[PDB]
Amino acid sequence: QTPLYEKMRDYAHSNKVQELLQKMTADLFIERPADPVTWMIKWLSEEQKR
Amino acid sequence: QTPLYEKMRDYAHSNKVQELLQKMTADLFIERPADPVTWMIKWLSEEQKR
Amino acid sequence: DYYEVMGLTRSANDIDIRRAYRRLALKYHPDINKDGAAGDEFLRICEAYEVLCDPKTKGFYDLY
Amino acid sequence: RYYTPYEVAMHNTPDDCWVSFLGGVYNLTDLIKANQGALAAPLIAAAGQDLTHWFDPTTKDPKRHICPATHIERFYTPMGRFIHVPPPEPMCNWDTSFGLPWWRDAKKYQIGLLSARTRVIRVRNVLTDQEDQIEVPCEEKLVEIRERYLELNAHAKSYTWKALVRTHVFQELDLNLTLEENGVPDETPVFEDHHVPTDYFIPVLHVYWNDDL
Amino acid sequence: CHEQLCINAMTAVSNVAEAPEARAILVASGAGPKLQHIFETATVEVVKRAAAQAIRQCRFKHLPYEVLPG
Amino acid sequence: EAAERRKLEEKERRMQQERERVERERVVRQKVAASAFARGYLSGIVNTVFD
Numbered sequence A, B: 001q002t003p004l005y006e007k008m009r010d011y012a013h014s015n016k017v018q019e020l021l022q023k024m025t026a027d028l029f030i031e032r033p034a035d036p037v038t039w040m041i042k043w044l045s046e047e048q049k050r
Numbered sequence C: 001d002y003y004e005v006m007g008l009t010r011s012a013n014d015i016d017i018r019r020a021y022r023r024l025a026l027k028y029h030p031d032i033n034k035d036g037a038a039g040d041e042f043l044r045i046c047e048a049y050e051v052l053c054d055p056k057t058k059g060f061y062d063l064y
Numbered sequence D: 001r002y003y004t005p006y007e008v009a010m011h012n013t014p015d016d017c018w019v020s021f022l023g024g025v026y027n028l029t030d031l032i033k034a035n036q037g038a039l040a041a042p043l044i045a046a047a048g049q050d051l052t053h054w055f056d057p058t059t060k061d062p063k064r065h066i067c068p069a070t071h072i073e074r075f076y077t078p079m080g081r082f083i084h085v086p087p088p089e090p091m092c093n094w095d096t097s098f099g100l101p102w103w104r105d106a107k108k109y110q111i112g113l114l115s116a117r118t119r120v121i122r123v124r125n126v127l128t129d130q131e132d133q134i135e136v137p138c139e140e141k142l143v144e145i146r147e148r149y150l151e152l153n154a155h156a157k158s159y160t161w162k163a164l165v166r167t168h169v170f171q172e173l174d175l176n177l178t179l180e181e182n183g184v185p186d187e188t189p190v191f192e193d194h195h196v197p198t199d200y201f202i203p204v205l206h207v208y209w210n211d212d213l
Numbered sequence E: 001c002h003e004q005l006c007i008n009a010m011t012a013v014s015n016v017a018e019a020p021e022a023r024a025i026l027v028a029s030g031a032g033p034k035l036q037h038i039f040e041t042a043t044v045e046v047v048k049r050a051a052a053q054a055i056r057q058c059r060f061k062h063l064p065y066e067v068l069p070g
Numbered sequence F: 001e002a003a004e005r006r007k008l009e010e011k012e013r014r015m016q017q018e019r020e021r022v023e024r025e026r027v028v029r030q031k032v033a034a035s036a037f038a039r040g041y042l043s044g045i046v047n048t049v050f051d
Helices: A002-012 A015-031 A036-048 B003-012 B015-031 B036-048 C014-027 C040-052 C055-063 D005-009 D029-034 D142-149 D188-193 E003-016 E022-028 E031-041 E045-058 F002-050
Strands: D018-021 D024-027 D064-066 D073-075 D118-125 D130-137 D160-165 D169-171 D204-208
Touching: A002 A015, A002 B015, A002 C040, A002 F002, A015 A036, A015 B003, A015 B015, A015 B036, A015 F002, A036 B015, A036 B036, B003 B015, B003 F002, B015 B036, B015 F002, C014 C040, C014 D188, C040 C055, D005 D018, D130 D142, E003 E022, E003 E031, E003 E045, E022 E031, E022 E045, E031 E045
Parallel strands: D118 D204
Antiparallel strands: D018 D024, D064 D073, D118 D130, D160 D169, D160 D204
């Protein structure tokens, strides 16, 4: 129904999450690691400083 | 459609990374943290333990 | 999507869309349905039927 | 058995992918597991979705058309090239050794059968008053309605069912006859055609206890 | 006749007929008409009550319990 | 008294099953919708990041 979707659409189409996810995916595709989960852990760790 | 683009599409559409992304985004739109950078770190840390 | 809001599937006919909009827009109209989570629902019902009741717009949406 | 559309929707992931098309529910998980590339994208993106619009009724293969660019007849794949679809031009990697297309290999990739319609049954436990709406396929024997209701009461086998069969008196229901044979009709089409809300009246199934030990 | 024996048997039948299958055996062995006659023709109140309870206990298949005979 | 005890026991167990079912129902209802939206939004994200 509209209420459950709207609560998630409003969250996900807000700038912080969306342009965090897009840059993360871009760098993930560029790097091409064997195991993505620890690479995302690293990337988020050295991105938390920024 | 250079060999890089095709290789990226093969990696992007692979099982591992795509299911991991789908899982992470579903969980993140459930919890809805006001600081996804850290929630992603804790979520990935607990996932990697398995 | 424009389809799931009506409840129909991607292969719905024209009479199927007529019936779906009929029931969904007689269940959520402001003068009938007093209040609830029926603000966005009626607007998306109207938008979905307006998009899907005209073959040119319907097809252009279906391809994209 | 059978599946409501929502039940098919529960499985949408490369780990458990279910698709409903032409009345059949298919578990394509081993396909996506064995074919992991850009070929698997257009049906991963429609995991748990209804895939009947891809195909045509007369033949079980997907729709075909005269390709505008090459003027050679081939499958209409606006979504993209799904598994088991040949490339438009002569390649050197698309083998045809495999046996049958997945939309034709029913024995190996079909489980259950999609319900053409669903209805709402209001089950009422008469001993301990607990109303419950539920959706079940409109063509199913009471044994599997009881199986659906087993998630509401783990002891529903001992209970006895009853319905307001026709004046109207609460009478027993045979298990092997569907809800329509047993005298519980479906009137939602008439409800809609007469501008009566489909949640105004719901048929009711009373569930009494049968003492055991 | 043999009144205490009759009421003891009646109580035993009432106890056993609570089991699911037992009912079908008791109605098969003719406990129905026997208990009906015992209830109908007797005047001792305690045995009459045992008879009414036994009859109601032998013909029930649902949790709502019908009113005791008589 | 034995009959009454059994009836009350079953009443209580059904009442408890109701609450447990409600909790699990809420969890699964949210999970499935989260998965569907994740599907759609991630398809969009991958298309845009590729472009």
